[PDB]
Structures are given as structure tokens and as C-alpha cells.
Amino acid sequence: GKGKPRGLNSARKLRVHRRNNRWAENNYKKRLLGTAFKSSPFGGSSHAKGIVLEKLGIESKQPNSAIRKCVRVQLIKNGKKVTAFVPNDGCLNFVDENDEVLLAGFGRKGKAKGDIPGVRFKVVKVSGVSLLALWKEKKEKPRS
Amino acid sequence: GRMHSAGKGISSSAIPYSRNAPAWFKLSSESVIEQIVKYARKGLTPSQIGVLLRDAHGVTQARVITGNKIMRILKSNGLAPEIPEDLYYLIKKAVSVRKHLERNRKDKDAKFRLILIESRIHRLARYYRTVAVLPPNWKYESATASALVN
Amino acid sequence: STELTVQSERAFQKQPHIFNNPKVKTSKRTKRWYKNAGLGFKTPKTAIEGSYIDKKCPFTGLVSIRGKILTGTVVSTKMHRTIVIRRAYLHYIPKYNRYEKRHKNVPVHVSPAFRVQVGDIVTVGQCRPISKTVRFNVVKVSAAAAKANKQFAKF
Amino acid sequence: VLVQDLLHPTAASEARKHKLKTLVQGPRSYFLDVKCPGCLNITTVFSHAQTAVTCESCSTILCTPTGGKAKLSEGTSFRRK
Amino acid sequence: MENDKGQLVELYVPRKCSATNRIIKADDHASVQINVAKVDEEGRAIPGEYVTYALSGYVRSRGESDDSLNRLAQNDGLLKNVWSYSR
Amino acid sequence: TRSSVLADALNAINNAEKTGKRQVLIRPSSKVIIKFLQVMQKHGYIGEFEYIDDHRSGKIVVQLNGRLNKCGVISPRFNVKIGDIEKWTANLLPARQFGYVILTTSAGIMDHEEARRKHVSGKILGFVY
RNA sequence: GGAUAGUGGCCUACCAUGGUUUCAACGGGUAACGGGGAAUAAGGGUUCGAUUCCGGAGAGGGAGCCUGAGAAACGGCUACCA
RNA sequence: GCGGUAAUUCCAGCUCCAAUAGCGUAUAUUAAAGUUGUUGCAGUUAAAAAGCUCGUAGUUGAACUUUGGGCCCGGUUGGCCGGUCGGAUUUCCAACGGGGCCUUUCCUUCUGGCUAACCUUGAGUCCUUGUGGCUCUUGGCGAACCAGGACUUUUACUUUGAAAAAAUUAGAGUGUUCAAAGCAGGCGUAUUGCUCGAAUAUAUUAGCAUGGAAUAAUAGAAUAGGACG
RNA sequence: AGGGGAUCGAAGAUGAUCAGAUACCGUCGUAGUCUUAACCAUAAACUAUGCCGACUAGGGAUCGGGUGGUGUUUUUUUAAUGACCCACUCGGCACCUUACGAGAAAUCAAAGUCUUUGGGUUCUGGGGGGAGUAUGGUCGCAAGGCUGAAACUUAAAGGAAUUG
Ligand SMILES: [Mg+2]
Ligand SMILES: [Mg+2]
Ligand SMILES: [Mg+2]
Ligand SMILES: [Mg+2]
Ligand SMILES: [Mg+2]
Ligand SMILES: [Mg+2]
Ligand SMILES: [Mg+2]
Ligand SMILES: [Mg+2]
Ligand SMILES: [Mg+2]
Ligand SMILES: [Mg+2]
Ligand SMILES: [Mg+2]
Ligand SMILES: [Mg+2]
Ligand SMILES: [Mg+2]
Ligand SMILES: [Mg+2]
Ligand SMILES: [Mg+2]
Ligand SMILES: [Mg+2]
Ligand SMILES: [Mg+2]
Ligand SMILES: [Mg+2]
Ligand SMILES: [Mg+2]
Ligand SMILES: [Mg+2]
Ligand SMILES: [Mg+2]
Ligand SMILES: [Mg+2]
Ligand SMILES: [Mg+2]
Ligand SMILES: [Mg+2]
Ligand SMILES: [Mg+2]
Ligand SMILES: [Mg+2]
Ligand SMILES: [Mg+2]
Ligand SMILES: [Mg+2]
Ligand SMILES: [Mg+2]
Ligand SMILES: [Mg+2]
Ligand SMILES: [Mg+2]
Ligand SMILES: [Mg+2]
Ligand SMILES: [Mg+2]
Ligand SMILES: [Mg+2]
Ligand SMILES: [Mg+2]
Ligand SMILES: [Mg+2]
Ligand SMILES: [Mg+2]
Ligand SMILES: [Mg+2]
Ligand SMILES: [Mg+2]
Ligand SMILES: [Zn+2]
């Protein structure tokens, strides 16, 4: 019958084994270890807002050759320092250091994007106003 | 099959359909029952009796000619031993083994054997013990067994 | 449990308000009181013939059996005048569609009208909080001993 | 094969089988009445001896044991029943 | 395989192995139908009139085609002895 | 060691069928085996069987035809709550038109359709189609 | 016995050595108030429930208590800590 | 995966698609996932059989003990008629279920209360030549259950049922103009009121209450300290 | 820790080889190899394949046990023996051919009797690396054994077969 006890009272064993082996599940283990809350730059939350330390020029991974334009951000709830990418042509001209950006995930569940090594985040808004806007020209960057 | 090894040997008495009879068998209940008790008297085990009453006499199966197992015939006529003979012969064995492991410490294979023998004893004990043929708290021990069997 | 002495405490043991007038010359010394607890539980003769006192006795004392009536097999008789039984049972886990063995130990007062030993099955009856843990009182032995005298010597 | 009588199998092919694998199982040992004409009476013996059966009065012998059937002792005879 | 009001619906009711009453499905091109001819008084084989039997490919592959033919034909009256129901 | 005596008897029948045979010698028979053999027979899926009496526990010879695809046993005799019988036959019968789940109730060892008519329930034994 | 509205190691005296546990006690974690319920739709499940109803708990933290049928109350008092 | 000079992929123009008062994105969870596998996984070589045996807990564990046959009672669907002024019930018929009897067969048990039921019969008869039919007291049914005594091997399973909040959910009725909803509403003499509603289901594990006696346990009589009187 | 220490021989030292040559090959040879008393508990400790039970299919060998025979050979006076021959039957170690059947295949009488999915039971695995690493516990004289993570990284790593 291989493995699993087929008895009518063998519930307990059958339960326990499952608990035991759920740990080999990547997500279940993450959920209970509270890996989210514990490690991980964001709270475990969807976005996080921090402040720009230096503008970086990350060289892409092979087989791609490029310079990828990023920002070192120091999260506000955390002090944790994080490097985030700044999407779309230019846009790195919208940031500047000490400015206040709003970071989000890269939609890879942790795990860096494509050819950007280490970057696990992207900018979404600077100075309270959204990259996207600034790009298109639907909006203008605030005073100071 | 085969409790303490990987043996798989089918091998047993094939008992007859004939639950009574032989019919060519004369004698009587009377006859065999006395015949059992004198051999009990000689100190024989029921097995030894069955075997002896088998070949030398005609006793196809003791229980047939007399609706009683040999060990029950003994019990009643007050002959039944302290402990069942299978338990006995297990213990008698584990002693002899043990005596040998003493005189030969180097014999790891014997150590192994003794375990096995005792582990059959100890489980057999617990059956008999369960079903009250042995007093609840009966126990086999090395130190006391060589007194027990003889 | 009790056994012997009866008047063995610092205070005088007596059934409350059961006066025996010393003036009136009697042939039994102590006038005793009892009841039938009800629910068809024979108030055994040892509780009427008795001399023990136990106020927490269902037949001679001021408890009252009402509520749950339970059975269980005796697993501890080391406490004076109270035992501990195990109520075993199987608990059903839907996802697997199977049950597992579980158990609980209920502590229960046992009147010296009974003689209980480990392994005896015992029908207990719920009563008022009688102690920190005991909420039940032994009310019938549905056992005996489990064939002890059929464990005597040799032929 | 594919279709046959499990219920009424031929005596022969039932004969050759193991004693535990006949239709209803049963023994294949027998009993005999053995003589050694010094005496007049006849001791019944099991086909399988273990015990080296001794005759009624004379400490003679009769048969010896084996792996199976007894070896009957030289000047003897037997019927079977 | 009828339907609501009588009406034999669902086409083609398959044959059947005369030895194992299992279905003789279409792609089974290992199955076989043997026509055994009815004869008459003094030789003479009566063309176009048969006692027939159909045997699944399964059976033939297992070798059980002959012994099974034996039993079928005989207990249908065209063999006497040859076969035996005991073994 | 020999565990569900039913199991072996069923499985044996199925390998006779598959191998194309017409007979099985099952061992060791039982009240339950008969009453299971008894149901199948009642509904076509086997021919005539026969108890042979070794003085032991029994043997049975079953004569079968080939109307039978499978006769299995459900190895833990689960409990079924008269609603749950629907969900059984659904899981393990070829369609709603034929085949039976046979179980065991206080009112007897019966297939589920007789179970449904008699309107009682109980433990689940096995199945035939 | 005392105490309570009253049962009860609730508390005290005296006396005893008990109670629980691999059928997981005890300890740890919970980014844990519990329930009705919510989300996902073959079935079996998985995940969630601070939050409209019920129960419980609290009123910056602890303790104490007055009034009163009912509070160990905080839009009551008393004390310490912040 | 595209981009190193004709970029189907970047930056735009044109055109074209998908969803549309809404559409992208980030995180989480759920389906897909039979990649947590009770249903339902995989382990020779892809991840995975402990070097080997013993062995406690745990799960598991051969067959066998009232079966078969006979009789009666009354139900619910369905056929072939319909008698009738869409539905009706008797006889004919099958079919599937329930109850109770006798077969050597405790139904816990005495002691009355109780009787509904025929072994009765006391008359005879409505009426088809009569066991088709029920009223009907004077010998002769226990169990249908009151209530008091005296006693009872333990359980698992399953059936029906009680006790059971509302909103939620499933779901009936009702034209909120539709609908999400809501539990309204509908009729006239619209001058003096008429009236249908505000269902049903689920509600399980435990406790309760009842029917069942297959399956699986437990206990019983062997130093007779057995069972009936 | 004693004894033993023939042989072969981790370390070391050498002769050569080599661009190098800490090696392969040759020499010398310490520990060791052997044994007692006590440790250590690991091997591709392999059938890379848990155990008990049932069922499903042909063949000739063979190892042990047994049964059957107006079998052979042993001579003596026939036997009795023993060895041998033939048939059968249990239970072994294996090979053969088949394949109803299984498998991703290679192959498999189990790896079969599984979406027609349930005889009983034990254990392990859940992408790859990080890593059998960190940590704590524990065993050990030690060397190390047992238990045994995460962060991070990553789109493959892997298996069997095919053609080159
Ligand atoms: Mg792991
Ligand atoms: Mg930096
Ligand atoms: Mg903070
Ligand atoms: Mg065997
Ligand atoms: Mg074993
Ligand atoms: Mg033997
Ligand atoms: Mg005490
Ligand atoms: Mg006290
Ligand atoms: Mg102490
Ligand atoms: Mg645990
Ligand atoms: Mg909290
Ligand atoms: Mg809540
Ligand atoms: Mg919760
Ligand atoms: Mg909160
Ligand atoms: Mg409060
Ligand atoms: Mg505040
Ligand atoms: Mg404090
Ligand atoms: Mg306060
Ligand atoms: Mg306020
Ligand atoms: Mg307030
Ligand atoms: Mg161009
Ligand atoms: Mg272009
Ligand atoms: Mg474009
Ligand atoms: Mg959408
Ligand atoms: Mg299931
Ligand atoms: Mg998998
Ligand atoms: Mg591997
Ligand atoms: Mg292995
Ligand atoms: Mg059984
Ligand atoms: Mg219910
Ligand atoms: Mg409602
Ligand atoms: Mg040396
Ligand atoms: Mg060197
Ligand atoms: Mg050199
Ligand atoms: Mg070197
Ligand atoms: Mg290893
Ligand atoms: Mg190997
Ligand atoms: Mg073979
Ligand atoms: Mg790539
Ligand atoms: Zn003689």
C-alpha cells in the first residue's frame, strides 16, 4: 500500500505527518517562521517609503550589456538600506539625493528582476508625486 | 512467516478430516487416558506422550479417541507443570545459551541469539500472563532462571 | 477509603443533627441516617451497616447526585477517599475521516461504602464541587477485581 | 487451463501434489501391524517413527527413525490399517 | 441501449468472444471468427451453413485459442473425447 | 499476516477474470465473503459458487462469466451517513445507470440501492461493476 | 474552621503523599480576543475573521476601594509608576 | 527574450487589439496544485528505504456461535380499467418496503392495574348459491404501559427525533420602473374596508432521545468460588 | 594500553620522468597491517530497490529435505548399503524465454494485479545552490557521529533514450 497508514484510527499519525511535511513547503514555512515580518526590507507590507542616498549605475547581467540606473533608499520605518531601480527612459533625472521616494516590489516574490543584480524593488513616486506622471508630463515636481 | 528469521517454510501436520474414528481402532477412552497418565507419571511432556502414543501404540490423535487435549488430561489428573512446556523449553534454551556466552565472551553471534530467544520468551510470557495461566507479575530473569528449569 | 479508627480526627465525626439521647437506653449506640440517591442506584448495604462518617458520601452524606452520569475504569487509588479514573474515547477528525484514541482522567470521591481497586469499572455521578478538582462521586462498581482468586498457587 | 474443474480434479494430479495443497488437505502417513515371528502378537506402528519402537515383550528393536519413514528391521512383515 | 420511448439508439452492438464473453472491439485485429461447416448424410459439407465461434485476440495471444476451441466445439457436439473438464 | 480475508478473495476473482478464466478457488471464505459473493451473484456479475468444507476455515470455488470488470474492497470499513453514500458511488462507479456499492448496515450486508430502498446506513465494504 | 452571596485549597490549621504526561504533560512562539461567519466554487480541501450580531476583556500602567440591587466602575474616588 | 545601423520588443507617429467608468501596478491569499496527495503523490537510475536485526509506545491483526423454512397484518408508488361530475376508490395484477407470528427460540422480572387484540360465541345475518362484513355480552392473549419492588457485562457504528438566535448562506412568494435590494404587498364600494404574507432548508463534532443487531471490539464456566430451585 | 612487527606499506627521504612533477614509475621505509583489553559506528555498509500476506506465466539447470521405482552401476550368494538415473513435492541461490501487465525510458515475475486510483505497517523526498554549512543539544580521548536551520542567490539543475 506503500507508506500512509490505512487504519481507521490512524488519524493522529496521518495528521501529524502532514504538519511535519508542510515544512518542506516553501510558502507554508515562510508563513509560520514569519519570514516576512522578520527579515525582508519592507515590513512584510506592500510598499515602503524611504529616502534617497546615492544614485547608482548598476551594470546589467549578461547576455545583456547596459547601465541600469538605480537608487539606494533608506527605508523610513526601518533604517534598512535598499537599492531600487528607476523605471523608464530618464526618470533618474526626476529623483536627486535626500529626496523621498516610495518603493514597491518587483513582482517576483522577493527575487530580483531580469538583468538587474540585487535590485528587488522599484521606485513608484518621488516627492509625493509618481514617476509615471512626471514622465508623461501630467504633473510637476514640488517646490523643495 | 517465521518469527525471528526470514525462513518461509510451510511445514505442518496435515490433520485428517476424520474428526472421530479410526474404526480399525479398538481400545477405549479408558485405555488411552490411563496410558497418558503413566507417561505423565514418568515425567514426560504431553508432546513426548503424543509422539510416544502415536508410533508405539495406535493413537492417531489423542483428542480424537478422547475429546480432550493431552495437556488438559494432565491438568485434571493434577499433573500439569508450573509453567507451560514451550515457555519451559524456551527458558531451558536461553539458559544453555547463556551458560555458553559466559564461557565464551568473544561470541557476539551468541549474544545475538540470546536476545532473540529471550524476546520470544518475554512475549510468550506476556501472553500466558495476560490470560491468567501465569500469575500477573510473573517474570523471567537470568539470575533466577537456572533455578527454574532445573 | 477510610478503614478502622472512625473517630480518628481532632474533631468528633458525626452525622449532623442526628441526635442519640443518652438518657434513652439503646441497642445500637449510634443512630444512623441514609438515603437512596435515586436514578435506581442501590444504596449498598455497607453504607447502612456501616459506621464510617464521610459527609461527601452519596448515601450517607450531604451531597446530591444530579447532572452527568459517567462511567470509566479506575486507574488511580492512591488518594484517601477519592480515586482517579480514565475515560477513554475516540475523537473524529473529519479531513481524514478517521478517529484517534484520546482520554481524560476525572478525579472522583469514593465513599467507604465501596471497595475499589485499580482496573475496576465504576459508574460515577456528578455532584457539587466537592474539592478543587473533584466534581463526581462513585456510585456503582460495575466490576469486581477481574478474576484475582483465579490467580492462586499451584495444584 | 482457462476453463476447468476445480471441484472434481483428477485423482492423479491431485496425488502428486503437496499434502497441504490437496483439495481438502490430509495426511500421507499410515499405520501398520508389524511382526517378528519370535512372538505371536503384532504391535501397531506409525509410518513415521522418531521413537525407535520396541516390541511388546522382547527388547528386540522394530524400526529405526529417519528423515521421514521408519526403516523396518530386517526380518519383519506388515499390513497397513 | 434504448432510450426514452423505446427506440434502439446508439449504433453497432459489438460481437463477443465465444470463450470469454468480453467485447470484441474494432481495433482488435487479432481476434478471429471460425466457421465450422454443417455436414450431412455421407460427407457432403453443405456450403453456406456454419456452426460459428468468435475468439478475442486476447485469448489467441495467450495461446488459449486451441484448448478453448476444443471445449466449445465439443460441448456443442462436434468433438467427442479430445477435451476433458478435469485436470 | 493475512489481513482482510475479503480482500484476497476479491482480488483473486479479478485476476481470474483478467486472465480470462472461468473459475477461482478462493481461501479462506467467511460469513462476509459469502454475503459478498452472494450479492454479486444476485446481480449477474458471477455465476454459481460453492463452499467446500475443509474442516478448517473454508474454501470457495466461484464460477464466473465475464460480465465483470472489477470487484474491489474498501479497506478501511468507513462509516457512511446516508447522505455520504451518494458521494461514494460517485467516486467509484462508472456511471449512474449501473454498478453497485455494497456496504454493511445493521439491517444486513447489502448493495446501496437496496440500502437506499430499505433506507438504512452503516459501514462500507466494497463494490462491484 | 474561617472567609463568601454561596460550593470549593478560596484561605488557615492539622494530617497525608499525592496530581499531569509520547493518547505530547510542562515550557516556548503567536505580526491570537473566541464565536456567528468571510474568500476560493467538481468533490475532498486551503486560507481568513481587529471590524455592523452574541460572548469576553479594557479604559496610559498596576493595585486599592467608596457608593450601591448591581462596579473591584475610571467621562467615581485613593496611592504609587509613566 | 529584445537593443552592437534595414529593432515584429526600446523612443515616438499612424493603425490595430482586450476590458471599459473604470483599467494598470505592488503585497497577501485562493483556484490551477494529484508540486502536502484521506479522497490523491513520489522514493532501481530524476529529490527520497535507516548498515543490520531486536523491540516499547502506536497503528494493524484468520475462520467459527439463529440460519433456513411456514403463516398472518397493513402501508407507497405503478400498471389495466373510472364509477365520476382535472381527481376518486374497490376488485385483477405485479414491484418495493414496514410490522407481528410458529418453527426447541427472554420479552429483565415478579406483584395488579388496562386491557387492543381472537383461540372465543352469543345470537344471527345486510347481501352475489358464502368465512366476501361489523356492531355485538357470560368460560378463554399480555406486554400497548401505567408504578412499586427486586436486577441489569461494557462500547464503537448507523437511523429517525428532540433541543435549538438573528443577519449570513441555499431557497419560496412579491414586477424595488430594472437590478443590487427590501419584506413587502395585493384588492375594492378608492365616503368611513377587503385580504395573501412575513415560508423552507442547512444547522455535522459533543450531550440528549429512539429504531436497528451486519461489521469491529468487551465481558462469561476449568483448582468449578459455575448455572438454575 | 600491552604484545607482535615476516610481509606489504598513508608520512617522510630519494632515483628518474617533466617546462614544472610536491605525483604516476623505481628505492629506502615510520605508522599501519596481526593479536589481546577498551574505544570509534562510519562505507557506492548496493539489489543504489522496507517488512508481513494474497493473487497473476512458461522453461531447463542446480543446492538441502522428503516420497515413489519387478531404474542403472557396486558382487558375494542374492541382498543391505552407497554413489548414480528418472518422476514428483516442499523450501534455497540464480539463469532462461515471454509478457496478459508496468514504466519517461533503460528495463521489470515485480518495478505487475493504480484516474476500473484502498490487504496490513514502517521509514524518507517536495526545484537548484546556499549546505550537511551556521547554531543549540548530545555522544566521543580524539578524529568525528547523531540531530540540523536561515539570509541570500538562482531558470534551471536532473533522468532515460535519439541522432550526430
Ligand atoms: Mg529539508
Ligand atoms: Mg552602496
Ligand atoms: Mg515603530
Ligand atoms: Mg507462508
Ligand atoms: Mg517481527
Ligand atoms: Mg518443520
Ligand atoms: Mg493521600
Ligand atoms: Mg479541606
Ligand atoms: Mg512529594
Ligand atoms: Mg508532537
Ligand atoms: Mg493580540
Ligand atoms: Mg471577532
Ligand atoms: Mg482565528
Ligand atoms: Mg490588533
Ligand atoms: Mg470594566
Ligand atoms: Mg491612549
Ligand atoms: Mg507588578
Ligand atoms: Mg478602574
Ligand atoms: Mg473619555
Ligand atoms: Mg463608563
Ligand atoms: Mg530605420
Ligand atoms: Mg523601425
Ligand atoms: Mg510601437
Ligand atoms: Mg481584470
Ligand atoms: Mg476517503
Ligand atoms: Mg511530485
Ligand atoms: Mg538518487
Ligand atoms: Mg536498504
Ligand atoms: Mg475478525
Ligand atoms: Mg441528526
Ligand atoms: Mg430563516
Ligand atoms: Mg611493521
Ligand atoms: Mg613523497
Ligand atoms: Mg625530484
Ligand atoms: Mg608530498
Ligand atoms: Mg549512510
Ligand atoms: Mg553493488
Ligand atoms: Mg517459474
Ligand atoms: Mg537566461
Ligand atoms: Zn518382538
UniProtKB/Swiss-Prot annotation, chain A:
Example GO biological process: translation
Keywords carried by this UniProt record: Cytoplasm, Hydroxylation, Isopeptide bond, Ribonucleoprotein, Ribosomal protein, Ubl conjugation
Positions carrying 3,4-dihydroxyproline: P63
Subcellular location: Cytoplasm
Protein name as catalogued: Small ribosomal subunit protein uS12A
Function in brief: Component of the ribosome, a large ribonucleoprotein complex responsible for the synthesis of proteins in the cell. The small ribosomal subunit (SSU) binds messenger RNAs (mRNAs) and translates the encoded message by selecting cognate aminoacyl-transfer RNA (tRNA) molecules. The large subunit (LSU) contains the ribosomal catalytic site termed the peptidyl transferase center (PTC), which catalyzes the formation of peptide bonds, thereby polymerizing the amino acids delivered by tRNAs into a polypeptide chain.
Cross-link (Glycyl lysine isopeptide (Lys-Gly) (interchain with G-Cter in ubiquitin)): K55
Principal subcellular localisation of the protein: cytoplasm
NCBIfam families attached to this UniProt entry: PRK04211.1, uS12_E_A
Protein source organism: Saccharomyces cerevisiae (strain ATCC 204508 / S288c) (Baker's yeast)
Highest taxon listed in the record's lineage: Eukaryota
Subunit and partners: Component of the small ribosomal subunit (SSU). Mature yeast ribosomes consist of a small (40S) and a large (60S) subunit. The 40S small subunit contains 1 molecule of ribosomal RNA (18S rRNA) and 33 different proteins (encoded by 57 genes). The large 60S subunit contains 3 rRNA molecules (25S, 5.8S and 5S rRNA) and 46 different proteins (encoded by 81 genes).
InterPro entries attached to this UniProt entry: NA-bd_OB-fold (IPR012340), Ribosomal_uS12 (IPR006032), Ribosomal_uS12_euk/arc (IPR005680)
Impact noted for substituting N64A: Lethal mutation
Swiss-Prot record, chain B:
Gene3D superfamilies: 4.10.860.130, S15/NS1, RNA-binding
Residues of the signal peptide: none
Disulfide bonds listed in the record: none
Family to which the UniProt record says this protein belongs: Belongs to the universal ribosomal protein uS15 family.
Name of protein: Small ribosomal subunit protein uS15
Predominant location category: cytoplasm
A family per Pfam: Ribosomal_S15
InterPro entries tied to this protein: Ribosomal_uS15 (IPR000589), Ribosomal_uS15_arc_euk (IPR023029), Ribosomal_uS15_N (IPR012606), uS15_NS1_RNA-bd_sf (IPR009068)
Curated annotation (Swiss-Prot), chain E:
Keyword tags: Acetylation, Cytoplasm, Ribonucleoprotein, Ribosomal protein, rRNA processing
Listed InterPro entries: Ribosomal_eS21 (IPR001931), Ribosomal_eS21_CS (IPR018279), Ribosomal_eS21_sf (IPR038579)
Modification(s) after translation: N-terminally acetylated by acetyltransferase NatB.
GO cellular component terms, A-Z: cytosol; cytosolic small ribosomal subunit
Cell compartments where the protein resides: Cytoplasm
Transmembrane segments: none
Signal peptide residues on this chain, from the entry's feature table: none
PROSITE patterns membership: RIBOSOMAL_S21E (PS00996)
GO molecular function: structural constituent of ribosome
Keyword set includes Metal-binding: no
UniProt keyword rRNA processing, yes or no: yes
Family: Belongs to the eukaryotic ribosomal protein eS21 family.
Subunit structure comment from the entry: Component of the small ribosomal subunit (SSU). Mature yeast ribosomes consist of a small (40S) and a large (60S) subunit. The 40S small subunit contains 1 molecule of ribosomal RNA (18S rRNA) and 33 different proteins (encoded by 57 genes). The large 60S subunit contains 3 rRNA molecules (25S, 5.8S and 5S rRNA) and 46 different proteins (encoded by 81 genes).
Protein name (Swiss-Prot/TrEMBL): Small ribosomal subunit protein eS21A
Native source organism of the sequence: Saccharomyces cerevisiae (strain ATCC 204508 / S288c) (Baker's yeast)
Chain's gene name: RPS21A
UniProtKB/Swiss-Prot annotation, chain F:
Keywords: Cytoplasm, Ribonucleoprotein, Ribosomal protein
Pfam families: Ribosomal_S8
Subcellular locations according to the entry: Cytoplasm
InterPro entries linked: Ribosomal_uS8, Ribosomal_uS8_CS, Ribosomal_uS8_sf
Primary role: Component of the ribosome, a large ribonucleoprotein complex responsible for the synthesis of proteins in the cell. The small ribosomal subunit (SSU) binds messenger RNAs (mRNAs) and translates the encoded message by selecting cognate aminoacyl-transfer RNA (tRNA) molecules. The large subunit (LSU) contains the ribosomal catalytic site termed the peptidyl transferase center (PTC), which catalyzes the formation of peptide bonds, thereby polymerizing the amino acids delivered by tRNAs into a polypeptide chain.
Subunit: Component of the small ribosomal subunit (SSU). Mature yeast ribosomes consist of a small (40S) and a large (60S) subunit. The 40S small subunit contains 1 molecule of ribosomal RNA (18S rRNA) and 33 different proteins (encoded by 57 genes). The large 60S subunit contains 3 rRNA molecules (25S, 5.8S and 5S rRNA) and 46 different proteins (encoded by 81 genes).
Family the UniProt entry places it in: Belongs to the universal ribosomal protein uS8 family.
Official protein name in the record: Small ribosomal subunit protein uS8A
Native organism: Saccharomyces cerevisiae (strain ATCC 204508 / S288c)
